[PDB]
Amino acid sequence: MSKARVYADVNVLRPKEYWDYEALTVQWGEQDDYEVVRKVGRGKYSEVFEGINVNNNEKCIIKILKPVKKKKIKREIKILQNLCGGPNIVKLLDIVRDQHSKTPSLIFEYVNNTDFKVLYPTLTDYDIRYYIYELLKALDYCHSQGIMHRDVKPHNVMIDHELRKLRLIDWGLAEFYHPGKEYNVRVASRYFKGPELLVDLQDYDYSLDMWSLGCMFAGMIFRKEPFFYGHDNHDQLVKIAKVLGTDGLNAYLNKYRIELDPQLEALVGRHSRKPWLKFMNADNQHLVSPEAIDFLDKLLRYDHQERLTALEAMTHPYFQQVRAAENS
Numbered sequence: 001m002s003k004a005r006v007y008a009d010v011n012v013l014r015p016k017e018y019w020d021y022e023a024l025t026v027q028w029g030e031q032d033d034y035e036v037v038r039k040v041g042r043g044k045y046s047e048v049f050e051g052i053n054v055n056n057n058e059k060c061i062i063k064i065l066k067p068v069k070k071k072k073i074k075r076e077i078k079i080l081q082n083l084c085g086g087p088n089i090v091k092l093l094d095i096v097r098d099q100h101s102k103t104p105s106l107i108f109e110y111v112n113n114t115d116f117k118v119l120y121p122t123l124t125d126y127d128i129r130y131y132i133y134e135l136l137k138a139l140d141y142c143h144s145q146g147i148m149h150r151d152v153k154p155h156n157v158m159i160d161h162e163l164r165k166l167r168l169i170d171w172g173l174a175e176f177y178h179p180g181k182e183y184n185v186r187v188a189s190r191y192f193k194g195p196e197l198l199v200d201l202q203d204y205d206y207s208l209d210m211w212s213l214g215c216m217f218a219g220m221i222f223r224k225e226p227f228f229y230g231h232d233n234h235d236q237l238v239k240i241a242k243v244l245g246t247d248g249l250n251a252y253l254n255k256y257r258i259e260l261d262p263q264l265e266a267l268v269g270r271h272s273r274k275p276w277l278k279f280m281n282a283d284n285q286h287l288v289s290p291e292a293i294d295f296l297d298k299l300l301r302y303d304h305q306e307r308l309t310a311l312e313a314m315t316h317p318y319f320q321q322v323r324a325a326e327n328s
């Protein structure tokens with residue numbers, strides 16, 4: 001068995017009105033109300049464009065979905081709606097469809113984002129602490145709302161560096177947390193998939209997002225994106241092993257009576273643990289202080305139960321300057 005150490009009973013105490021998303025009746029707005037201005041991206045699940053709200057003439061983001069199941073789409077909507085107003089949670093503005101094909105589009109707020117590939121390398125020590133902090137506020141909030149994002153990665157963190165505004169986007173994999181429930185482990189992106197997913201542990205929780213966050217954090221301070229560069233689910237676990245070491249992996253597996261798949265256990269092999277400092281270099285030295293290391297260390301743990309919760313992370317001393325600045 002395995003349950004979240006915090007916010008475990010959020011959905012238990014809330015009525016079906018909150019988490020029974022398959023009972024959602026979508027209210028569609030007017031598509032014409034939003035016009036395309038330029039494509040900003042694409043993914044396996046949609047095509048994204050910078051749009052404009054003809055009425056108020058305000059900038060927006062138009063996400064044109066590719067064929068998806070009604071269940072999956074009512075889940076993203078129900079969740080978006082559930083989290084609206086939360087700290088740094090992207091706001092869902094409208095939901096429309098194409099009469100002819102029924103193709104749906106989710107209209108979100110616009111964020112003048114700067115590609116992480118280019119943005120992150122310019123971030124200062126303080127910028128990093130600041131943005132991670134903002135992102136943590138979003139995670140604690142949704143976790144406190146009985147929700148797991150399940151796909152934390154740079155690509156889903158929009159940042160308007162100019163205005164230092166951050167938003168956690170793409171809640172297309174998010175789920176409501178139910179104690180003991182077994183979820184699909186086919187979530188998140190490879191480079192940010194936690195061990196629980198890599199070893200099929202299905203009764204995972206909010207903590208999976210913290211491993212992802214840790215991956216993002218390590219890449220940022222060590223200036224190595226992505227930090228864990230594997231090519232398939234099995235090789236992802238091998239890269240993780242060559243760093244944290246296999247003893248930790250074994251104890252983890254043993255604690256959860258989990259048996260690895262033969263071929264997989266074959267690839268992993270046996271690896272000593274590599275100190276976090278073995279990743280320091282002239283390119284990232286101005287970013288790897290002990291606090292940054294202590295913090296990273298408490299995020300990237302095999303046992304998801306051992307990882308810091310979002311609330312705990314926000315209070316780590318690494319963020320003290322950000323906290324002191326805010327409380328002013």
Ligand SMILES: CCN1CCN(c2nc(Nc3ccccc3)n3ncc(C#N)c3n2)CC1
Pocket residue numbers: 040041042048050061090108109110111112113114154155156158169170
């Ligand atoms: C990172 C990959 N991809 C990029 C496009 N996309 C995307 N892009 C933006 N902003 C943006 C504006 C100008 C240039 C680039 C981005 N936003 N802003 C809000 C959301 C929302 N909701 C969103 N999604 C979705 C994610």
